[PDB]
Structure formats: C-alpha cells, structure tokens
Structure 1
Amino acid sequence: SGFRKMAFPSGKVEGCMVQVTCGTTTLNGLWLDDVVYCPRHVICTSEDMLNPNYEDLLIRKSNHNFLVQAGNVQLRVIGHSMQNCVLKLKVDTANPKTPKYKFVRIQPGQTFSVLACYNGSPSGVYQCAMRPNFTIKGSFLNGSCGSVGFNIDYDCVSFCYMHHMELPTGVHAGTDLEGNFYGPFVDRQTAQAAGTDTTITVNVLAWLYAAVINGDRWFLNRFTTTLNDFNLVAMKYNYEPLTQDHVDILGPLSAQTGIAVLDMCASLKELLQNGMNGRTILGSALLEDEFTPFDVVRQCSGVT
C-alpha cells in the first residue's frame, strides 16, 4: 500500500554519464557504445548563446577541443558530428557499462525519470512528465545540461530527453536523443514563451484509480458522465480532452477497481467544480497528473 512519485532505479544511466568540456563550458554527456551525446551549445560562449550559428561555431572546433572525462579518466575523441541540436562525439572506447538501450521520442503526458548531473556526476533522480506545452518542470542548475530523461523496460533503457534550456519562466526545454527539441523551442538565449500548461486528464484519472486501490475513496460520487459532457468541463478547467484511446488505456484500472472510466470522469468533474474542500488524495491537495496509467499499474503491481 501507499503511492509515491517513483523514479526508475538510476544505476544503468549513472554508468553512462560523462563530463564534456569545450573551452570554458562544462556540461554532461551520455556515453553509449563509442559515442558521447551532449547539447551542441557546449561550443557556445554565453555571448554566442544570444544568436549562435552552430555550423559556423563548429568549424572552429576539432576533436581535441572536446574534453570527455568518465570518472577521472579522459576519453580520446576520434570524431564529432552535429545531429540537430546534439553533438555526437566518437570516442576510441565503447562504454563498458552500456546498457541495452533505445532512443524514443515521447508524447506529451508521458512520464520519465531524470538523472540530474553536474560535471558528469549524478546529483539526484526525480520523475517528470512531458507537459502538453512540450516543457518539463525539472530541477536543473547551470552545469545540468546533458542530464537525460529515461524509462526502463526490465533491462532496456529508453532515452527520451536530454536537458538543454531553462526558459525565462524557469520551466525546462530539451531534445530527444536525435537532437530534436520537444515543442517549438530553440537553443538560443532569446524570449521563448511556453503555451498553456494544461492538466494531463488521463494521468489524473490513473492517479484517482491509484487512490481508490490505496483506500482513498472519499471523492467517489454517485454520478457518471459522457466523454462529450466531461470534455466541456475539462476545456473550462484547462484539462486536456479525453479520447476513447485514453478510456481504452484506463481499461485495466477500471477492471481492477470495478469503477467504469466514465464514472471516475464524473468524480473528477465534481472535484473540478467543487474543489477538494481542504481534503487530500494520496497526500495531495491538488490533482496529480504526472502518473501515466502504465505507471499506476507498474507501481500497484510491483514490476521490476
């Protein structure tokens, strides 16, 4: 019993973190096989960051200008290329701790673990979601760039995020491991505003299921609704529209609890309209939206 915001165990990713230095900029790299992946802004002077021409900045850089340190041992860089907004540094040594891995591009509402690193050294692990506006609300200081987001499927690490940017509003932006930004963001020190940070409705519903499974049941009501009726109320409260695809994904939690998805929708509708009235659900005074249906099943079932 009990329900926690839970990260994946980080060891497999800890074994991949290195330090990358270009001139006076130090940040983190991910060492998989004989490639080190890092943000291309490692080549920029904070002056460069105002209007960087990365192709032109890169002409001035050689393999020996990229200093890669794994623990307190230097890796030899034998090649470098830019792919979108990441650099790939080819090194002469395959990472001996390379786990089975994939690069995946996640969808908004998907959750992942972040291993926050400084100077190639892990500081902490926390759980994030890709927001509907393609930001994440992370915890990142200067030096944390190149920190990665990941999911684990038994022994396969799916890498989904590399940290690049803090927006003036202190929310976060980054890329997949092919160097493509999530959302409309660019690696330039310019005014970039996030769109509406809507609530991930399907995740709230999953977490209300988690709450019922763990004995927090006070919010269960006598009503049902329809997707169309729910969605009118959702839109008014800056919740993402619920689709039949989301209803299908909640089926296993519906089954386990015997609460129809549309009944839980009608419970959520009353919580939006009525508020919490100073009550809590799973120790929260707001509706949590950074657990996916898969996360709830995993944690409620004890997958390793």
Structure 2
Amino acid sequence: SGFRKMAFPSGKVEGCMVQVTCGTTTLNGLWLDDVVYCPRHVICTSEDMLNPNYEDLLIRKSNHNFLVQAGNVQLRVIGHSMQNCVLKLKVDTANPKTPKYKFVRIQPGQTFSVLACYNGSPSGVYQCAMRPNFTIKGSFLNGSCGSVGFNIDYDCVSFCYMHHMELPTGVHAGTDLEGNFYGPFVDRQTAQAAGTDTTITVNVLAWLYAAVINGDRWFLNRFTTTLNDFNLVAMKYNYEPLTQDHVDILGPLSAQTGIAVLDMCASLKELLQNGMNGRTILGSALLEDEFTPFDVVRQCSGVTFQ
C-alpha cells in the first residue's frame, strides 16, 4: 500500500566513492577493482575551463599529481588514461568493496538512482530519469561532479551516469562510464542549451496503472482509442509519441489490472484535453513521468536486491 518515488539502496555504491584531487580541484571518483573513474575536468584550472585542450593538459600531469583518498587512506596512483570525457586512474590497491557491476548507456525515459557525493562522502540518494532532451533534473552543488547514477539488478550494479555539469534552468548533464555525454553537450565552460523537453508518455501510463493498483480509479472513462488518435492528441501537449513497443511493454500492467492499454490511453487523452479539475492522482496534481513500467512492477510486487 502506498506508492513512492523510490531509490535503490545505495550501500554497494557508497563503498566505491573516493575523493580525487588534482592541484586545487576536488571532486568524486568511482573506485572499482584497481581503477578510479572521474570527470576529466579534474585536471583543469579556472583559466583552462573556458576552452581546455584536455589531451594537452593531461600530458603535463604525472601520476603523483593525482591525490586519491578513500576515507583515511591515500591510494597510490600508478597510471592514468583518458577515455572520452572520463579519466581512469590505475591505483595500487583493488577496492575490497567492489560489487558485481557493469557499465551501461541508458535511453531517454529510463530511470536510475543518483548518489550525490561531496569530497568522496555520500550525502543523499534520489531517483530520476534521463529526460527526452538528454538532461536530468538532479540536485547537485559545486563538489558533486563524479557522483554516479545506477540501477541494481539482483546483486549487479549497472552504472549508467556520472555527473559533469549544470545547464540553464537548473538541469544537469553528464556521461556514461565510458565518458560519452548523453545528448549534444561538451565538458566546456561555454554557452550551451538543452532542447525543449517532452513528457515520457509510456511512463505516465505506467503511473496511471500504479494509481489503479493503489485504488485511484476516478480517471477511468468508457472509451478506447487508436494509437494514431492518441498520438494526435498527445503531440499537442508535448508528449512523446507512444509506439507499439510501448503498448506491448505496458502489457503486464494491463493484465494485472484488467484495463486494456488503449483504454488507459483514452483515459489519459481525456486528462490532457480537460485537465484534472483540481483533483489528484496518487497525491499528485500533475501527471508523473519518472516511473517506468518496470519501476511500477518492482514497487508493487516488492522486488528486492542481494
């Protein structure tokens, strides 16, 4: 009973956070096995940030220019390389708390937990989504760079995000753990703007299913819709197109509630056209788009992590 925006438990990632310092710049690093990963802009001064030639900057650095601290213990750096926009520091010590893990690149509309860190120390955890414009709506202050986003499957941590920068209107941009940016952003202190954002329709529908599961039913109507007619209405309110794959993906939730996906779509269509009339769904006065169908199943079925 109840439905909450729920993060993964963070303990397996907490054990991997370290502090990386290069001269006067400090930020967070991820220590897995004998590698520490962090944003490459740890090597820049404020001078360099406007237009850094990173390759050039790194050449002038040495192993001993990188100070890596795990709690009380300094780790000796014995090597360094750059992959895309991340720096990999080989250290002499493998992390005894390294979990089973992999690195993944997620798609827009997918969700993940962020462990916000300052000076190598966990501060807080929260769930967000990769927006269709390839930003995230995070909560990040100066010092948070190198904080990571992740999913847990059973006992395997999938790392999908590392934090690099803030963009206009207080949204955030970063990379996968191979150092490729999500979206068309660069790690440069420069004028950059995200595209116009849209609502993740398939996630809105999953959350309507969560509502029904949790006993909010008032928005169910008597109608059905075609996919074509649903999209005509959705386009008009800046919703992402719903595809047949999305319809198929919502099938398990549809079977659990006995409400056909295109019946739920007719309900959503009406909500978009007429509004909510000051009425709430799962205690929300707007439609929520940061739960995937899998997130809903997980929470409503009680999936747990080893």
For normalisation by structure 1, the TM-score amounts to: 0.99
Q: How far 1:169 sits from its partner (Å)?
A: 2.5
Where does 1:137-176 land on structure 2 (aligned, <5 Å)?
137-176=137-176
Q: How many Å apart are 1:46 and its aligned residue? A: 2.1
Task: Work out the CA distance in 1 between the residues paired with 2:281 and 2:63.
Answer: 53
Residue-pair matches, total: 304
What secondary structure, in the 3-state scheme, does the structure 2 residue paired with 1:12 have? helix
Q: Per-residue deviation at 1:47?
A: 2.2
Q: Percent of aligned positions with the same letter in both sequences?
A: 100
Deviation, 1:55, is 0.6
> Using the alignment, how far apart are the partners of 2:223 and 2:72 within structure 1?
61
Superposition deviation, residue 60 in structure 1 = 1.3
**Aligned equivalents of 1:223 and 1:296: distance in 2?**
24
How big is each residue's C-alpha offset from its partner over 1:192-224, in whole Å with a ceiling of 9 and x where there is no partner?
Answer: 111111000000000000000000111111111
- 2-side partners of 1:71 and 1:276: how far apart? 50
Q: Give the Cα separation in 2 of the matches to 1:123 and 1:294.
A: 27
Whole-angstrom distance in 2 between the partners of 1:33 and 1:184: 31
TM-score normalised over the length of structure 2: 0.99
1:276 Cα offset (Å): 1.1
Aligned to 1:131: 131
**Per-residue Cα deviation, 1:247-266 (whole angstroms, up to 9, x for no partner):** 11100000000000001011
| SS of structure 1 residue aligned to 2:29 | strand
SS of aligned partner of 2:46: coil
Distance 1:168 1:112 in 2: 22
Matched-pair contact (CA < 8 Å) for 1:18–1:71: yes
Match of 2:254, SS?
helix
d(CA) in 1 for partners of 2:49, 2:172:
16
Residues in 2 aligned to 1:136 and 1:182: alpha-carbon distance in whole angstroms: 10
CA RMSD of aligned residues (A): 0.6
Secondary structure of 1:47's counterpart equals helix
Contact persistence 1:168–1:191 (CA under 8 A) = no
Give the whole-Å Cα distance in 1 for the aligned partners of 2:102 and 2:181. Answer: 18
Asked whether the 8 Å contact 1:108–1:134 carries over to 2, the reply is yes
Q: Indicate whether 1:17 and 2:17 are aligned.
A: yes
**8 A contact 1:19–1:69 mirrored in 2:** yes
1:168 Cα offset (Å): 3.0
Per-residue Cα deviation, 1:94-120 (whole angstroms, up to 9, x for no partner): 100000001000000000000000000
Q: 1:116-139, CA deviations, whole angstroms, 9 ceiling, x for partnerless residues?
A: 000000000000100000000000
Q: Secondary structure at the match of 2:219?
A: coil
Paired with 1:230 and 1:48, the residues of 2 have a C-alpha distance of 50
Q: Which structure 1 segments of 5+ residues have no match?
A: none
SS at match of 1:194: coil
Deviation, 1:72, is 1.4
